[PDB]
């Protein structure tokens, strides 16, 4: 609240300093931001404690950055951490005390939890609460009565209005409890699903699962994990532990296919007990319990097919023990978020790898599903070898003179097709691919602009893939890339970042970018994170290039596009010039060649 | 360096400067490797010796060390060819110099210097001294232009600010000596005192200024005896740098925070720590004032917390690379005053003028293909005079 002569807020008169400050490696700002030391001998103990109560926002190598909020604190109580259980240790760990504002905030957040509990039974949602006083003063707003369908006091609530009420209670200072007591539940018989000994659970995976299962009752929340970290395995394990009906929801045809393979590979459950509620193909969804479906079909808004209609009615009627939603970052979408209310589930676990977006709808994920249970440390995984180390880089490609003139001259937005297609980046990518091609490194180019992607591919006569590409040709190209030594590069369009199972690649060039989308960058980055059989963290075998054009709008997006990655700890190095580019022969080595491309670019319209 | 200072002096002042007590000794330590040895050898000799002997007294290998040493001392004029006997005054004085004839202080020096820097920056609370302010103003690192308003800080002031204390102080005293002559203070008398430290009206005023900079402290109500501080004769780092342009400095002295704020945005200030971010806005702001990326990297490097000393390089490459790039963008458009030519009837005259400009150095850039060149306004008169002369 107090501002120094500079921008920083003043806290000299706010909180004191512990005499043994050096022993205590923890800081506590009044705003809730916390700065831990990654060099302290007791760093690990602090890391576990802070992660339990706070959600990371920046975890560079030396000094991590944690901020706590109401959602973060509620999760701590769910795992059994009381206000004194956390504040006492926080004061002990704090090297500068705890400001009263945080103290009262912690007290208010912890006490305002568990008073209101939401339980669904017999397809009816009852807002149970041991304390009756909470309900008495909770019915002041008229929305509650109209929302409601027309000790331990409970009342049934309308199915459709659950989401509206859930967000209302969050700002009402009375969060709802979504814990599932699968251990004590006889209404829905347990499913015959078991985890085979073959599956191996990594220490972070166990910790993420442990945080989800704070007590005998499973907690509904979001577990963010890298795609190469094996987030699919964790989802399977959670379903196996619940031992009740689970409805995994994908986002595309590829997503549903992989999940079924993951279930069979890691779960002993029989093949016949798994169904694919997919329009393209089905396996008698009503017949068995464990099902894999997609947001589009379940949330499909237009006319429903007769066969789908029966399945949809069957899904609505039944009650699901678990509702795994992979790629939760798309949930707050209008159609996608409707699926939450359409189906009934006790705890709706959420998995993903890039929990970031521009529109401030990510915060809704806290109430749409639950608090962010776990968010693995990408840097720590790199040290442990679970994830391939990446030498993130940003190759600056100076714009050719003529190209800039039209780019600056025109105030229209043809520039997206212009600065994405310039000779220097073309030579840069052409040179960059050539260097990696002779190094036996697998390349995965990317480009939002299909027009640029096709032009780059034909000139480099490489197997470019994109949306309307035939499925058969899509598989044929991938198989050659994985197997054929003669080919070690595939030019994938945006479809690559959506969902796929691609072979591990040593490098990932990105000539163009869709825009300032932290999702796409992290989505595309996860492709090379696939750990190799016998690599090492320090070898930096995996690389990532995000080619950009200097003095162009592309730079603004690139800096705005790397915010999420740097927060994890990745350092994006800049490369003004590439050694050996001049000696190596490359296309567009003469003014005429650039002129024809510019004319074609201008003729694009 | 001190060698540069003594090098630019006349023979007349040099021997006078070679006072008996110390100067013959202080200038001796300066002698890097070999001149020391040669000085002692010809210290008891009253007979000059031929120049050939000195040349052949160093083996063929490392012969360069001989030439640089002889050239260095010839400027110092310790000997004369006399045809290489040493100066009798220096010989006598040196022979007289060779068998012939605390914890609180450093804190005071640390504190006194710190307050001076506080005044140097726009610190509302600082020590007031009219003599000190004007001295810095005429030192070339400050300009007021308005006695009523406190003086501001020039471009050179910021560069001086980010320098390390030894280089910062040494340069500061260097200007004092140059300005001492301008104000009329004898250079020799004041200079000799500095050497005597490492072992009149002007002296009292000179000592008063030294006492003001924190180098000395009488401690006895300005008595004749003085106890020089450590800085008179001539530490762990604290800043922690992340990979996301975030600085965590364990600074309690407001000076360090003020220095960091010059090229970064401050976010939080804890009792024993402060959080700052190195964003484009701050760095270019510092570059605009006059700083260059080298000082910031050096300043961050020198004040490097021990935690990041283990990693090599100490400063992460991205932070260093980003800082260098930000300054480069500022000077993408290099402005240089000049005068253009047009309508060259013949290239021979243009070539002849080009040769004339090259000889005089007036030319700044030339274009043979377009038959044109650019000349600075200073050389514009010279070429214009040449054109008139035909």
């Amino acid at each position: 609240t107090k501002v120094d002569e500079y921008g920083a807020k003043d806290y000299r008169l706010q909180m004191p300093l512990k005499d043994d400050h050096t022993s205590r490696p923890l800081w506590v700002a009044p705003d809730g931001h916390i700065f831990l030391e990654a060099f302290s001998p007791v760093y690990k103990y602090a890391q576990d404690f802070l992660v339990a109560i706070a959600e990371p926002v920046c975890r560079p190598t030396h000094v991590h950055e944690y901020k706590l909020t109401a959602y973060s604190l509620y999760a701590a109580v769910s795992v059994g951490l009381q206000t004194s259980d956390i504040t006492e240790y926080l004061r002990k760990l704090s090297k500068t005390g705890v400001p009263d504002g945080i103290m009262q905030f912690i007290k208010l957040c912890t006490v305002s939890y568990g008073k209101v509990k939401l339980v669904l039974k017999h397809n009816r949602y009852f807002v149970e609460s041991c304390h009756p006083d909470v309900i008495q003063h909770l019915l002041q707003d008229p929305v509650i009565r109209e929302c409601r369908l027309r000790q331990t006091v409970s009342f049934e609530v309308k199915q459709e209005m659950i989401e509206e009420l859930q967000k209302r209670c969050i700002h009402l200072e009375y969060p709802l409890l979504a814990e599932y007591d699968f251990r004590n539940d006889s209404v829905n018989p347990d499913i015959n699903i078991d985890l085979k000994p073959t599956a191996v659970l990594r220490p972070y995976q166990e910790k993420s699962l442990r945080k989800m299962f704070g007590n005998g009752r499973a907690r509904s929340g979001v577990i963010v994990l890298p795609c190469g970290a094996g987030k699919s395995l964790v989802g399977v394990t959670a379903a196996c532990t619940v031992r009740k009906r689970c409805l995994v929801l994908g986002n595309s045809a590829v997503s549903v296919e992989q999940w079924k393979a993951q279930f069979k590979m890691w779960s002993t459950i029989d093949d016949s007990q798994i169904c694919r509620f997919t329009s393209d193909a089905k396996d008698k969804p009503i017949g068995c319990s464990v099902a894999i479906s997609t947001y589009s079909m379940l949330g499909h808004t237009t006319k429903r097919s007769w066969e789908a209609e029966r399945v949809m009615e069957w899904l609505k009627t039944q009650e699901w023990g678990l509702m795994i939603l992979d790629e939760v970052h798309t949930i707050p979408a209008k159609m996608f978020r409707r699926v939450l209310t359409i189906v009934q589930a006790h705890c709706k676990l959420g998995l993903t790898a890039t929990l970031v977006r521009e529109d401030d709808k990510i915060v809704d994920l806290n109430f749409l599903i639950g608090p962010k249970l776990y968010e693995a440390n990408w840097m720590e995984l790199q040290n442990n070898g679970y994830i391939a180390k990446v030498q993130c880089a940003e190759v600056w490609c100076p714009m050719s003179p003529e190209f800039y003139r039209e780019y600056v001259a025109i105030k229209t937005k043809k520039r997206i097709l212009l600065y994405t297609m310039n000779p220097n980046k073309f030579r840069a990518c052409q040179f960059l691919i050539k260097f990696h091609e002779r190094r036996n490194d697998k390349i995965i180019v990317f480009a939002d602009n299909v027009f640029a992607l096709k032009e780059y591919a034909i000139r480099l006569n490489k197997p470019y893939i994109y949306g309307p590409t035939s499925q058969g040709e899509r598989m044929q190209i991938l198989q050659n890339f994985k197997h054929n030594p003669k080919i070690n590069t595939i030019f994938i369009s945006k479809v690559g970042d959506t969902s796929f199972d691609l072979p591990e690649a040593n490098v990932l060039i990105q000539i163009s970018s869709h825009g300032g989308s932290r999702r796409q960058e992290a989505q595309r980055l996860g492709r090379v994170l696939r750990a190799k059989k016998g690599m090492v963290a320090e070898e930096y075998n995996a690389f990532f290039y995000s080619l950009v054009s200097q003095d162009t709008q592309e730079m603004a997006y690139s800096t705005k596009r790397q915010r999420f990655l740097v927060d994890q700890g990745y350092s994006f190095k800049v490369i003004t010039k590439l050694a050996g580019m001049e000696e190596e022969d490359l296309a567009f080595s003469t003014k005429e060649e650039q002129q024809q491309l510019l004319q074609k670019v201008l003729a694009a319209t | 360096n001190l060698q540069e200072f003594l090098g630019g002096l006349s023979p007349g002042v040099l021997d006078r400067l070679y006072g008996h007590p110390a100067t013959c000794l202080a200038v001796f330590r300066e002698l890097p490797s070999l001149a020391k040895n040669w000085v002692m050898r010809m210290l008891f000799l009253e007979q000059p010796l031929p120049q050939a002997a000195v040349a052949l007294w160093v083996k063929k290998e490392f012969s360069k060390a001989q030439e640089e040493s002889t050239g260095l001392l010839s400027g110092l004029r310790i000997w004369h060819t006399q045809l290489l006997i040493l100066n009798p005054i220096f010989r006598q004085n040196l022979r007289i110099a060779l068998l012939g004839g605390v914890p609180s202080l450093d804190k005071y020096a640390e504190e006194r210097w710190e307050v001076v820097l506080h005044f140097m920056v726009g610190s509302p609370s600082a020590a007031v001294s009219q003599d000190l302010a004007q001295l810095l103003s005429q030192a070339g690192l400050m300009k007021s232009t308005e006695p009523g308003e406190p003086p501001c800080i020039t471009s050179a002031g910021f560069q001086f600010l980010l320098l390390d204390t030894p280089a910062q102080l040494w340069y500061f005293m260097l200007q004092y000596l140059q300005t001492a002559q301008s104000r009329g203070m004898d250079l020799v008398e004041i200079l000799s005192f500095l050497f005597q430290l490492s072992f009149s009206d002007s002296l009292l005023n000179f000592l008063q200024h030294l006492r003001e900079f924190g180098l000395v402290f009488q401690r006895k109500r300005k008595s004749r005896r003085y106890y020089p501080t450590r800085l008179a004769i001539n530490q762990p780092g604290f800043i922690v740098v992340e990979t996301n342009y975030r600085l965590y400095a364990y600074t309690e002295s407001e000076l360090q925070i003020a220095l960091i704020a010059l090229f970064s945005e401050m976010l939080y200030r804890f009792p024993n720590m402060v959080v700052a971010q190195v964003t484009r806005e701050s760095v270019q702001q510092a570059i605009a004032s006059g700083i260059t990326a080298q000082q910031i990297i050096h300043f961050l490097r020198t004040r490097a917390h021990p935690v990041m000393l283990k990693q090599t390089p100490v400063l992460p490459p991205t932070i260093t690379d980003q800082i260098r790039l930000w300054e480069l963008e500022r000077d993408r458009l290099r402005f240089t005053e000049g005068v253009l030519y047009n309508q060259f009837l013949s290239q021979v005259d243009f070539e002849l003028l080009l040769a004339h400009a090259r000889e005089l150095g007036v030319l700044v850039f030339e274009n043979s293909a377009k038959r044109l060149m650019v000349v600075t306004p200073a050389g514009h008169s010279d070429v214009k005079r040449f054109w008139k002369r035909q």
């Binding site: 880089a393 075998n541 690389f543 190095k573 490369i575 590439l578 050694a579 | 490459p317 690379d321 260098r324």
Partner: peptide, 15 residues
């Protein structure tokens, strides 16, 4: 063998 490229090993900025 399998050594990192020059433009990644050291800064390519003119400084």
């Amino acid at each position: 063998a399998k050594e990192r490229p020059i433009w990644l090993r050291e800064s390519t900025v003119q400084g």
